[PDB]
Amino acid sequence: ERDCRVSSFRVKENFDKARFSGTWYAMAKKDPEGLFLQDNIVAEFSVDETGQMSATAKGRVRLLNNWDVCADMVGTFTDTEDPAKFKMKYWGVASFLQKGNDDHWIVDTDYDTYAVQYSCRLLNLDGTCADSYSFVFSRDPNGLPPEAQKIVRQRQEELCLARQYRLIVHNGYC
């Protein structure tokens, strides 16, 4: 019944870059193929005088054969016609860390409590996503309040992802 076409997904109306700035803690993540960020994931968003948004991120990533490593990542966002949909160019401070360019959608936020992020890296031929990821962020590293949690689960469902998230732990690893 429900529409899982990416073109159908609602995003944050009149998204406000300035209100979104600051520290966000990742509480949950839906992983893409070849996942990168594992846990202890903390993002820092900024915006400059030109209205350009950027971010940094810290997190554990496990390179294969079980090598752990606290990644330090950088992101810069190019605006689109939709104030909540961006193109994110990202890279690591270390050259060998993953780089690329993903869609970056702010699906919902209230700025001071919760945020839901979404990226489809590759579409199916029917408009659904073939390879997606999503972060749920909290301003409080101890988690969301119940009201926010309930809103977020709804958004997760609307993205057709609700069954596919895992919790992100924060234990000072970085």
Ligand X SMILES: CCCCCCCCCCCCCCCC(=O)O
Q: Is 149 annotated as a binding residue?
A: no
Give the range of 12-20, 32-40, 138-146, 150-158 binding ligand X by CB under 6 A: 32-40
Least gap, CB of 83 to ligand X (angstroms): 17
Closest CA to 59 of 76, 75, 38: 38
Closest CA to 79 of 115, 50, 118: 50
Token representation of residue 4: 């899982």
What is the Cα–Cα distance from 116 to 136, expressed in whole angstroms? 5
Q: Check binding of 84 to ligand X (CB under 6 A).
A: no
Give the range of 13-21, 36-44, 62-70, 161-169 binding ligand X by CB under 6 A: 36-44
Q: Check binding of 143 to ligand X (CB under 6 A).
A: no
State phi, psi for 168 to the nearest 5 degrees: -100, 120
What is the Cα–Cα distance from 77 to 20, expressed in whole angstroms? 13
CA 172 to chain centre: 20
Q: Which of 17, 28, 108, 117 binds ligand X (CB under 6 A)?
A: 117
Q: Check binding of 133 to ligand X (CB under 6 A).
A: yes
Residue among 38 and 158 whose Cβ is closer to ligand X: 38
Q: Which of 95, 163, 171, 172 binds Cl ion (CB under 5 A)?
A: 163
Q: Check binding of 73 to ligand X (CB under 6 A).
A: yes
What is the Cα–Cα distance from 141 to 146, expressed in whole angstroms? 14
Q: Which of 32, 46, 151, 162 binds ligand X (CB under 6 A)?
A: 32
Q: Check binding of 36 to ligand X (CB under 6 A).
A: yes
| H or E segment and range at residue 20 | helix 17-20
Q: Which residues bind ligand X (CB under 6 A)?
A: 31-32, 35-37, 43, 55, 57, 73, 75, 90, 117, 133, 135
